[PDB]
Amino acid sequence: KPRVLVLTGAGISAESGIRTFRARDPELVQAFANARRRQLQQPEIQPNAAHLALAKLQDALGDRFLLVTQNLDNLHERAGNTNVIHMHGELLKVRCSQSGQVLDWTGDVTPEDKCHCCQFPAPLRPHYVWFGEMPLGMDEIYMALSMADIFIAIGTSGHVYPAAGFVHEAKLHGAHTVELNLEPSQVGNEFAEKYYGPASQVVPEFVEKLLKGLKAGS
């Protein structure tokens, strides 16, 4: 059946209580990053109906589905999605400054913390991508875009590149394009189909619509 590529942004995690990360000084930056990592470990923070509907969608489509997120949180994973591409990295990971190896990390990061991949342990760096830095997984993403039959952007502002250009890439390759957002994005007019409203309402409704049209469950 059709190949589906989903791009998500901060809007989909808003109803779960996750705010935009940093809308500089290393110590303050580390404090904020550490507070956001900590937030993700609170029992009260959970995936919402929009996250859960995307897991249902991957269950129905198997390898014909790919989820790409700008988000640093792990709510897609917790909802049940697998092989989620974090194009801006993750808060619950760090990277060895020397080897570049990525490690799971749940607690605070401090300058005292070191890698366990190198002969002599090296400092740890954020795994998230900041403005000016190069996004992750781009070869895989553009390959997926070139093969997608439907491209769905959810909770994205249209302000942040390269992610905001994906809808244009989808169009060039002949994908149907769908925007699901609280309000119109900066590139809302570039989408062929669009629904607006809270993600926890809009996303499950669309996913049902799509699954039924695909004759692939509910």
Binding site: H88, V129, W130, F131, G132, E133, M134, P135, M138, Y142, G158, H159, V160, Y161, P162, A164, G165, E169, Q186
Partner: peptide, 8 residues
């Protein structure tokens, strides 16, 4: 396409 993470 591609390029660094950047605001509009």
């Amino acid at each position: 396409k591609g390029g660094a993470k950047r605001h509009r």
